[PDB]
Ligand binder design. Structure first.
Ligand code: R6S
Length: 291
């Protein structure tokens, strides 16, 4: 019952476009009586063989995850012979946390941000117990099920660690979200639980800027290295900036202990970054104090 027939997927709209993939809102309505449920359908935008094998691995990863803060796998659809493989997931109605936060910023306070932050930590820790490296954590990948629950919502870049190493080396061709990447990911293409923690620090920054426009990591980092650079030079300068302990600023209104969580996630020393369990503990302690 995790096999969807393509003929019954009714396209409703395009939700998002990304890592060689696209996500659409559809209605699965096999009875053709308009009682089927609305689902999210992910497909490749250009189905090469390398992208198909990556997509199949991403599907297997998501099917292996069951957690309150991980988007639910529903099934696959490939009635177009081999190709046009599509991943069926639950549809979350409030969209990405990036959009949601931006749209409701005047009625989401810091205790609510910390609720979201803690759920993100629990999701990421579960990923780590499976030895999965997410790589692409960002508020655009975090989805809002309702006002009290968010979920990690996309796994297109997630890799499994080798059984004998604590990192995974990978250089994907294309534009990489460098303003969320740990320094050792920029210099050595090394991804680990610790670089996921660096990126989680960027997600926390994102949350506390409420997705204010000029305050995004790309905007702040390009302001710090100078908007006069272009091309590969950008990466180079970013690397230098991070190696001289250049960092994203404290967002307006962010308390010092929250910014300190951020700065501890952004340690150049990979082994000195906190664990996700410790991140959840600290966030939950602060949230309790605020109440
Ligand atoms: C699996 C899933 C489940 N439910 C939802 N619901 C949902 C509902 C509404 C909106 C918007 C649409 C219009 N605006 C105005 C209002 C709400 C929405 F965007 C999503 N979306 C999902 N995936 C999903 C969708 C879109 C994007 C995703 C991921 N990313 S992404 O992960 O980075 C990437 C690129 C796929 C790699 C970034 C964009």
């Amino acid at each position: 019952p995790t096999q969807f027939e393509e003929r019954h997927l009714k396209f409703l709209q395009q939700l998002g476009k990304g890592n060689f993939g696209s996500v659409e809102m559809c209605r699965y309505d096999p009875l053709q009586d308009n009682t089927g449920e609305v689902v999210a359908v992910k497909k490749l935008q250009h189905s090469t063989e390398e992208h198909l094998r990556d997509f199949e691995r991403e599907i297997e990863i998501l099917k292996s995850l069951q957690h309150d803060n991980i988007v639910k796998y529903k099934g696959v659809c490939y009635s177009a012979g081999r190709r046009n493989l599509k991943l069926i997931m639950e549809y979350l109605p409030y969209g990405s946390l990036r959009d949601y936060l931006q749209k409701h910023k005047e009625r989401i306070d810091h205790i609510k941000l910390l609720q979201y932050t803690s759920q993100i930590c629990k999701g990421m820790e579960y990923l780590g117990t499976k030895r999965y490296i997410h790589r692409d954590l960002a508020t655009r990948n975090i989805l809002v099920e309702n006002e009290n629950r968010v979920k990690i919502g996309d796994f297109g870049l997630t890799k499994v660690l080798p059984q004998d190493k604590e990192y995974y080396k990978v250089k994907e061709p294309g534009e990489s979200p460098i303003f969320w990447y740990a320094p050792e990911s920029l210099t050595e293409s090394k991804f680990s639980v610790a670089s996921d923690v660096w990126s989680f620090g960027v997600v926390l920054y994102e949350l506390f800027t409420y997705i204010e426009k000029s305050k995004s990591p790309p905007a702040e980092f390009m302001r710090m290295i100078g908007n006069d650079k272009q091309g590969q030079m950008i990466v180079f300068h970013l690397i230098e900036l991070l190696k001289n302990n250049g960092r994203l600023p404290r967002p307006d209104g962010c308390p010092d202990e929250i910014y300190m969580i951020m700065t501890e996630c952004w340690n150049n020393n990979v082994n000195q970054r906190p664990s996700f369990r410790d991140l959840a503990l600290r966030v939950d302690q602060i949230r309790d104090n605020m109440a």
